[PDB]
Scaffold this motif. Structure first.
Motif, PDB file in Angstrom:
ATOM      1  N   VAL H 114       0.854  -1.227   0.000  1.00 42.07           N
ATOM      2  CA  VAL H 114       0.000   0.000   0.000  1.00 42.07           C
ATOM      3  C   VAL H 114       0.878   1.261   0.000  1.00 42.07           C
ATOM      4  O   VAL H 114       0.322   2.340  -0.266  1.00 42.07           O
ATOM      5  N   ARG H 115       2.173   1.138   0.298  1.00 38.32           N
ATOM      6  CA  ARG H 115       3.061   2.325   0.276  1.00 38.32           C
ATOM      7  C   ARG H 115       3.251   2.752  -1.183  1.00 38.32           C
ATOM      8  O   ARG H 115       3.979   2.049  -1.897  1.00 38.32           O
ATOM      9  N   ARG H 116       2.658   3.857  -1.610  1.00 36.33           N
ATOM     10  CA  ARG H 116       2.896   4.341  -2.994  1.00 36.33           C
ATOM     11  C   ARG H 116       4.216   5.108  -3.066  1.00 36.33           C
ATOM     12  O   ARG H 116       4.623   5.666  -2.033  1.00 36.33           O
ATOM     13  N   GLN H 117       4.888   5.086  -4.229  1.00 34.41           N
ATOM     14  CA  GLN H 117       6.099   5.929  -4.419  1.00 34.41           C
ATOM     15  C   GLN H 117       5.834   6.919  -5.558  1.00 34.41           C
ATOM     16  O   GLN H 117       4.808   6.754  -6.229  1.00 34.41           O
ATOM     17  N   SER H 118       6.736   7.886  -5.779  1.00 30.04           N
ATOM     18  CA  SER H 118       6.597   8.866  -6.889  1.00 30.04           C
ATOM     19  C   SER H 118       6.964   8.253  -8.244  1.00 30.04           C
ATOM     20  O   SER H 118       7.988   7.553  -8.318  1.00 30.04           O
ATOM     21  N   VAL H 119       6.167   8.529  -9.280  1.00 30.28           N
ATOM     22  CA  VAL H 119       6.462   8.017 -10.651  1.00 30.28           C
ATOM     23  C   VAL H 119       6.470   9.241 -11.570  1.00 30.28           C
ATOM     24  O   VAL H 119       6.183  10.331 -11.062  1.00 30.28           O
ATOM     25  N   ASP H 120       6.763   9.083 -12.862  1.00 32.46           N
ATOM     26  CA  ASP H 120       6.664  10.253 -13.776  1.00 32.46           C
ATOM     27  C   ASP H 120       5.587   9.985 -14.830  1.00 32.46           C
ATOM     28  O   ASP H 120       5.704   8.982 -15.522  1.00 32.46           O
ATOM     29  N   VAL H 121       4.581  10.854 -14.962  1.00 31.90           N
ATOM     30  CA  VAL H 121       3.483  10.535 -15.921  1.00 31.90           C
ATOM     31  C   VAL H 121       4.038  10.627 -17.347  1.00 31.90           C
ATOM     32  O   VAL H 121       4.731  11.620 -17.648  1.00 31.90           O
ATOM     33  N   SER H 122       3.766   9.619 -18.185  1.00 33.00           N
ATOM     34  CA  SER H 122       4.268   9.604 -19.586  1.00 33.00           C
ATOM     35  C   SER H 122       3.686  10.776 -20.384  1.00 33.00           C
ATOM     36  O   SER H 122       2.591  11.241 -20.028  1.00 33.00           O
ATOM     37  N   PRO H 123       4.315  11.255 -21.505  1.00 32.86           N
ATOM     38  CA  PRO H 123       3.831  12.437 -22.228  1.00 32.86           C
ATOM     39  C   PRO H 123       2.576  12.133 -23.051  1.00 32.86           C
ATOM     40  O   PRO H 123       2.003  13.042 -23.596  1.00 32.86           O
ATOM     41  N   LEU H 124       2.162  10.872 -23.096  1.00 38.67           N
ATOM     42  CA  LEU H 124       0.912  10.514 -23.809  1.00 38.67           C
ATOM     43  C   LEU H 124      -0.161  10.543 -22.733  1.00 38.67           C
ATOM     44  O   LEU H 124      -1.207  11.164 -22.947  1.00 38.67           O
ATOM     45  N   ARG H 125       0.144   9.921 -21.595  1.00 41.07           N
ATOM     46  CA  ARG H 125      -0.808   9.914 -20.457  1.00 41.07           C
ATOM     47  C   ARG H 125      -1.113  11.361 -20.060  1.00 41.07           C
ATOM     48  O   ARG H 125      -2.272  11.638 -19.736  1.00 41.07           O
ATOM     49  N   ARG H 126      -0.113  12.241 -20.024  1.00 44.84           N
ATOM     50  CA  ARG H 126      -0.385  13.661 -19.683  1.00 44.84           C
ATOM     51  C   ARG H 126      -1.463  14.225 -20.615  1.00 44.84           C
ATOM     52  O   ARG H 126      -2.344  14.946 -20.119  1.00 44.84           O
ATOM     53  N   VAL H 127      -1.398  13.905 -21.910  1.00 46.32           N
ATOM     54  CA  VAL H 127      -2.408  14.380 -22.906  1.00 46.32           C
ATOM     55  C   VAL H 127      -3.749  13.678 -22.673  1.00 46.32           C
ATOM     56  O   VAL H 127      -4.787  14.351 -22.761  1.00 46.32           O
ATOM     57  N   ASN H 128      -3.733  12.402 -22.284  1.00 45.97           N
ATOM     58  CA  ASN H 128      -5.006  11.641 -22.199  1.00 45.97           C
ATOM     59  C   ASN H 128      -5.739  12.069 -20.936  1.00 45.97           C
ATOM     60  O   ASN H 128      -6.963  12.247 -21.005  1.00 45.97           O
ATOM     61  N   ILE H 129      -5.009  12.228 -19.836  1.00 52.07           N
ATOM     62  CA  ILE H 129      -5.623  12.666 -18.548  1.00 52.07           C
ATOM     63  C   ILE H 129      -6.098  14.111 -18.694  1.00 52.07           C
ATOM     64  O   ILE H 129      -7.200  14.414 -18.229  1.00 52.07           O
ATOM     65  N   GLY H 130      -5.257  14.957 -19.294  1.00 54.79           N
ATOM     66  CA  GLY H 130      -5.587  16.382 -19.457  1.00 54.79           C
ATOM     67  C   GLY H 130      -6.921  16.582 -20.131  1.00 54.79           C
ATOM     68  O   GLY H 130      -7.718  17.362 -19.602  1.00 54.79           O
ATOM     69  N   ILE H 131      -7.149  15.935 -21.273  1.00 56.87           N
ATOM     70  CA  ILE H 131      -8.433  16.085 -22.023  1.00 56.87           C
ATOM     71  C   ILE H 131      -9.555  15.481 -21.176  1.00 56.87           C
ATOM     72  O   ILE H 131     -10.610  16.125 -21.049  1.00 56.87           O
ATOM     73  N   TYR H 132      -9.320  14.304 -20.599  1.00 58.65           N
ATOM     74  CA  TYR H 132     -10.363  13.611 -19.805  1.00 58.65           C
ATOM     75  C   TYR H 132     -10.796  14.518 -18.655  1.00 58.65           C
ATOM     76  O   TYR H 132     -12.006  14.650 -18.432  1.00 58.65           O
ATOM     77  N   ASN H 133      -9.838  15.146 -17.973  1.00 58.23           N
ATOM     78  CA  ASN H 133     -10.161  16.000 -16.800  1.00 58.23           C
ATOM     79  C   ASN H 133     -10.987  17.212 -17.240  1.00 58.23           C
ATOM     80  O   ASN H 133     -11.944  17.555 -16.522  1.00 58.23           O
ATOM     81  N   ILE H 134     -10.624  17.814 -18.379  1.00 64.13           N
ATOM     82  CA  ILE H 134     -11.383  18.987 -18.901  1.00 64.13           C
ATOM     83  C   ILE H 134     -12.846  18.575 -19.050  1.00 64.13           C
ATOM     84  O   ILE H 134     -13.722  19.264 -18.488  1.00 64.13           O
ATOM     85  N   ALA H 135     -13.091  17.469 -19.754  1.00 62.63           N
ATOM     86  CA  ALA H 135     -14.482  17.054 -20.033  1.00 62.63           C
ATOM     87  C   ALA H 135     -15.207  16.625 -18.759  1.00 62.63           C
ATOM     88  O   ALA H 135     -16.425  16.847 -18.701  1.00 62.63           O
ATOM     89  N   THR H 136     -14.507  16.055 -17.775  1.00 66.81           N
ATOM     90  CA  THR H 136     -15.229  15.488 -16.603  1.00 66.81           C
ATOM     91  C   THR H 136     -15.586  16.603 -15.627  1.00 66.81           C
ATOM     92  O   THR H 136     -16.601  16.465 -14.930  1.00 66.81           O
ATOM     93  N   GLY H 137     -14.791  17.670 -15.605  1.00 67.79           N
ATOM     94  CA  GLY H 137     -15.161  18.800 -14.741  1.00 67.79           C
ATOM     95  C   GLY H 137     -16.419  19.466 -15.242  1.00 67.79           C
ATOM     96  O   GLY H 137     -17.296  19.765 -14.415  1.00 67.79           O
ATOM     97  N   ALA H 138     -16.488  19.681 -16.554  1.00 67.73           N
ATOM     98  CA  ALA H 138     -17.698  20.240 -17.189  1.00 67.73           C
ATOM     99  C   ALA H 138     -18.876  19.300 -16.928  1.00 67.73           C
ATOM    100  O   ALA H 138     -19.959  19.799 -16.587  1.00 67.73           O
TER     101      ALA H 138
END
Lengths: 101, 137, 100, 140, 75, 50, 151, 184
Positions: H114-138
């Motif tokens: 259960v101990r999570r560590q720090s990772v680096d979000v991939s530059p594709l995931r950054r684009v996929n999460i970014g668009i998803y978050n925009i639409a889900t907030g609306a």
RNA sequence: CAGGUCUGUGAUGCCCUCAGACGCCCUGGGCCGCACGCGCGCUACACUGGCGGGGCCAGCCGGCGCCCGCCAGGACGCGCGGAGCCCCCGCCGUGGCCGGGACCGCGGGCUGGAACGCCCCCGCGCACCAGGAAUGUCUUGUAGGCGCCCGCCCCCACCGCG
């Protein structure tokens, strides 16, 4: 009062006379489709005065006479009264009993 | 041809005003307070709806040409879902009488001619429909 | 005389029906018999639960009876085509019917 | 500029704000001859938003409501279509709906009939399943 | 929690309500309904009056959403 | 007499040919064969799988 | 509607040089091309006026990339049946592209014109293979399955 | 190419040189309805018009599944409402919104008991999460409000592009990144 | 596998029954009751929505016309024939409201020998404002949304199979 006619007028009311006033099911049963000999013969016993026929509908002349009706085990006693005329006696006699949980 | 060159909706609305102005059809006014189709629940709020339906039905019979479509077929063209029940909703045909009244007026008007099976548009009616279409263009 | 006699070949098996087609075309080729008009296949289907009882995950047996029908057009003397029926190879379990 | 406050018509304060074809829909929760439009359409226009109903036109709306065939409304509509006792068809609206319903319910008790006996126990009439959906609020 | 102004707003405050929407550079029917607290049903009929005026031009017009921007009113 | 109390008609008495069973007649193409009875006789009718 | 032989049934002759077929999602379009004034007609209706008003640009997309002048001088009669509105808008752009290309045929200009279309949009001149999958017993969906009550 | 017959892709270049490769305006087609299979291939998704990815994210919750035609209509009206207020190219304001909404750090267990560590979000995931978050907030904002989906989508994009925390997507990015900094 | 089916079977050992029948029929009634617990499903909780007109799109595969009726349905004939979603314009407009459609009172039909079955008209206007602990299915034409057909069938699908 029943469907306009007063009780005395409605008991004198002929079965084909009281039918335009009755509801749709009654018009199909006493008019277009009609009834068989056994249904008529039970009505003849009412005329004689002075059953398993759940299908049979109440006729105006029969009012005031109580007819036994089978529920499938015992002959339930069902009285005939003015507002129930033209309504099948199958809704007057109950096969089941109260829930009693 | 012509009725296609003008968008279908911009023709039907203008034709509805035309079919009320020329006195074509003449609303029964007994079907005015009825709702088309068992499928719907609140009845048309247009109040000129008979004329829109009348202009739409001639435009259908025009594109049908010699197909000679029936009134029941036109009712299936105005069929919608019967929504508002717990049981899943299904498509339900439009009221036959309304369309039967519309096609009856056209037969008397001679805008539409009678044919084997269903009636079809008459040449005299076609002339009115295409001249109106080109006039809108 | 000269009427049109409609031959209809109804067969469950495609290879059997194709064989009847070859014989009918060959016998009537001289009599101007028409090329086979293949009917849309009649894929009559019954899907039934595999189990006699209701036990187990419900499984389904998908049975399809495909019927292949060829309509044939010959216009000529009737007596010749009656004999043409004898000439064509007889396939057991495959039926031919002539309608004027 | 022309807008008026809610008027009490037929024992209910019908809000002036809501469209007139639907402000009448909640007529005390009892009545509705119009089916969303017919009663008002016959006399006046709909979509008025309400609060502009002229009192004379309001009286005219009341008149058609009270007398159905005087205005030639369709006999296929109407809350009551045969009158079990009277033999006549008329629209029944507001408190009369409750009174007639109680008399019909009393009539099934008076002539013992399964619909009434089920009604007395609160058992479902017309609906035929109680084994599972009859839990209701843990009671029928 | 509703917008009580429903039918023809009120009386003389209608002119100030018209002034507020004219003050906005670009308007949408829903935006007047929340900002002016007058309902969006009222907004559509109010908007057509100031579109006939020529104060605002509909940049995009759809049955779903209708959006307008002021043609001028720069100075 | 006996005839009036014997096989009076109340409805159709339909059975699967081969089984004489009222249940699951499956008369989709007029083949009144039982659902279970049909699986034993499908090869004979010629019904085939994918 | 289903691949019926009804090519000449709508229009008799008319010197239709080509009869292309464009098919997307169970929708087929037979497009008939002859020398014309640059007119394109779909289902006896102007191509510009098409039912998905939003997708009315997709229909006119091959004309824009290839060029209006190349299109000018052609009349196309398109009949679409089967499928549904969006596929019928995809089928007609494919049918128009294939048919206009057929005029160039095996020419080097066709190879450039096929490449020109294939670059802006590939599969504009190539049929899309995807087709519906069948429902399987135990699931309402083709691959979805019923919820397991226990376990 | 003018998206919605109104906006070019000529000036739409992503400033973020880490995210520019995964955002593409070259394949843009008026009306974002390209039926190209993005599911096929691990990175074919990257070579897709950004506006089409937004049009695919908009249709969610099931009751609105598959209606691309209705989603792209919203995108056009939202773009007009961004043009009306921002006064800039709305395809370019979306590009800045996608670039900002994407967090660069996430928390994952990393082979821990259960101990999570720090990772680096991939530059594709950054684009996929970014668009998803925009639409889900609306999506959440318009659920029970007189405000239309088009208006709230227009405002999240306008807020993300600057970086205002009012955007549900930027708040999400700052929460994800901060949990990642502590689990570091 | 001692999983399930002897109640599909002129499949069948053995036991029971075997003219006051456990044969086979005939009338009536139940299986569909219901303080309640649980498993599939279905419809909702709204504005990306409801409601009105208009466009109109299939496939497994597939009949229609005319007249009347508010529909439902009917009469009289004949040889045939086609979706929702979505798009377009209005309206309501964050209100358990026109969301939703449970219930419940007349009434109109249908099918059959007979309703308690189904359909429909005007009412009537339930919870539900997004569902805890848990849990299930799914990787492209897939999920999900949305229609449609068939099986059984007098009528009848919130089911199965397509």
């Amino acid at each position: 009062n029943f469907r306009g006619v007063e009780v005395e007028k409605l008991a004198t009311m002929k079965i084909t006379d009281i039918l335009p006033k009755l509801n749709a099911r009654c018009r199909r049963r006493i008019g277009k489709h009609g009834l068989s000999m056994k249904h008529l013969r039970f009505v003849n016993k009412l005329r004689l005065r002075r059953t398993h026929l759940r299908d049979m509908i109440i006729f105006p002349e029969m009012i005031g006479m109580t007819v036994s009706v089978y529920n499938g085990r015992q002959f339930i006693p069902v009285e005939i009264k003015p507002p129930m005329v033209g309504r099948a006696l199958r809704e007057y006699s109950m096969s089941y009993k109260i829930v009693s949980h | 041809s012509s009725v296609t060159r003008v968008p279908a909706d911009v023709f039907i609305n203008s034709f509805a005003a035309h079919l009320k102005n020329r006195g074509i059809i003449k609303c029964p006014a007994f079907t005015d307070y009825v709702k088309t189709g068992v499928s719907r629940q609140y009845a048309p709020r247009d109040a000129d709806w008979f004329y829109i339906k009348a202009a739409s039905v001639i435009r259908h019979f025009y594109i049908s040409g010699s197909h000679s479509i029936g009134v029941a077929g036109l009712a299936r063209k105005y069929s919608s879902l019967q929504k508002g029940k717990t049981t899943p909703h299904h498509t339900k045909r439009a009221s036959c009488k309304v369309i039967r009244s519309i096609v009856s007026q056209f037969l008397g008007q001679k805008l539409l001619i009678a044919g084997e099976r269903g009636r079809h548009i008459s040449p005299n009616g076609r002339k009115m429909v295409e001249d109106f279409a080109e006039g809108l263009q | 005389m000269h009427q049109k006699y409609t031959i209809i070949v109804v067969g469950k098996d495609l290879k059997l029906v194709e064989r009847y087609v070859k014989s009918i075309v060959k016998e009537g080729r001289a009599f101007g018999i028409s090329g086979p008009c293949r009917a849309p296949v009649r894929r009559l289907t019954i899907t039934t639960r595999k189990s006699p009882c209701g036990e187990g995950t419900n499984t389904w047996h998908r049975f399809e009876l495909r019927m292949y029908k060829r309509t044939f057009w010959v216009t000529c003397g009737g007596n010749d085509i009656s004999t043409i029926l004898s000439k064509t190879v007889v396939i057991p379990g495959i039926q031919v019917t002539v309608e004027v | 500029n022309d807008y008026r406050d809610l008027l009490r018509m037929f024992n209910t304060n019908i809000q002036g704000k809501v469209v007139l074809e639907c402000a009448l829909v909640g007529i005390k929760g009892i009545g509705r001859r119009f089916a969303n439009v017919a009663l008002k359409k016959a006399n006046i226009d709909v979509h008025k938003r309400a609060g502009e109903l002229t009192a004379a036109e309001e009286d005219a709306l009341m008149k058609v409501l009270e007398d159905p065939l005087s205005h030639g409304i369709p006999a296929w509509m109407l809350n009551r279509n045969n009158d079990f006792e009277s033999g006549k068809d008329m629209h029944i609206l507001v408190n009369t709906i409750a009174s007639t319903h109680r008399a019909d319910l009393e009539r099934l008790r008076k002539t013992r009939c399964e619909r009434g006996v089920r009604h007395h126990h609160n058992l479902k009439v017309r609906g035929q399943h109680t084994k599972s959906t009859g839990r209701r609020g843990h009671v029928v | 929690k509703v917008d009580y102004p429903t039918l023809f707003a009120d009386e003389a405050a209608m002119n100030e309500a018209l002034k507020f929407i004219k003050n906005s550079k670009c308007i949408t029917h829903t935006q007047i309904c929340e900002r002016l607290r007058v309902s969006v049903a009222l907004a559509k009929r109010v908007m057509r009056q100031l579109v006939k005026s020529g104060d605002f031009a509909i940049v995009s017009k759809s049955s779903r959403m209708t959006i307008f921007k002021n043609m001028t009113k720069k100075e | 007499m006996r005839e009036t109390e014997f096989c009076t008609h109340i409805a159709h008495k339909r059975e699967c040919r081969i089984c004489g069973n009222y249940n699951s007649v499956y008369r989709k193409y007029g083949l009144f064969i039982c659902r279970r009875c049909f699986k034993e006789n499908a090869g004979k009718i010629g019904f085939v799988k994918l | 509607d289903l691949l019926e032989r009804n090519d000449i049934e709508v229009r008799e002759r008319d010197k239709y040089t080509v009869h292309t077929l464009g098919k997307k999602k169970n929708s087929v379009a037979v497009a008939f091309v002859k020398a014309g004034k640059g007119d394109i007609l779909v289902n006896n209706v102007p191509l510009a006026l098409v039912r998905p008003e939003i997708l009315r640009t997709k229909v006119s997309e091959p004309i824009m990339i290839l060029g209006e002048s190349l299109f000018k001088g052609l009349d196309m009669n398109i009949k679409v049946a089967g499928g549904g509105h969006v596929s019928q808008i995809y089928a007609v752009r494919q049918a128009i592209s294939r048919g206009v290309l057929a005029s160039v045929k095996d020419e080097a200009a066709r190879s450039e014109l096929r490449a020109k279309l294939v670059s802006y949009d590939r599969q504009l001149v190539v049929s899309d293979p995807r087709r519906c999958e069948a429902k399987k017993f135990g699931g309402r969906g083709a691959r979805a399955r019923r919820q397991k009550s226990y376990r | 190419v003018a998206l919605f017959n109104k906006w070019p892709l000529t000036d739409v270049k992503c400033q973020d040189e880490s995210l520019e490769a995964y955002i593409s305006i070259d394949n843009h087609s008026f009306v974002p309805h390209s039926a190209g299979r993005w599911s096929a291939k691990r990175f074919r998704k990257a070579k897709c018009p950004v506006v089409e990815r937004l049009t695919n994210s908009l249709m969610m919750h099931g009751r609105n599944s598959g209606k691309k035609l209705m989603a792209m209509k919203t995108v056009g009206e939202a773009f007009e409402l961004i043009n009306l207020y921002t006064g800039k190219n709305p395809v370019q304001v979306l590009v800045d919104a996608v670039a900002n909404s994407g967090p660069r750090e996430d928390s994952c267990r990393i082979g821990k008991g259960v101990r999570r560590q720090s990772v680096d979000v991939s530059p594709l995931r950054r684009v996929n999460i970014g668009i998803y978050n925009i639409a889900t907030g609306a999506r959440k904002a318009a659920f029970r409000k007189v405000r239309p989906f088009a208006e709230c989508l227009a405002e999240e994009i306008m807020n993300a592009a600057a970086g205002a925390d009012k955007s549900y997507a930027i708040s999400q990015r700052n929460s994800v990144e901060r949990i990642a900094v502590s689990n570091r």
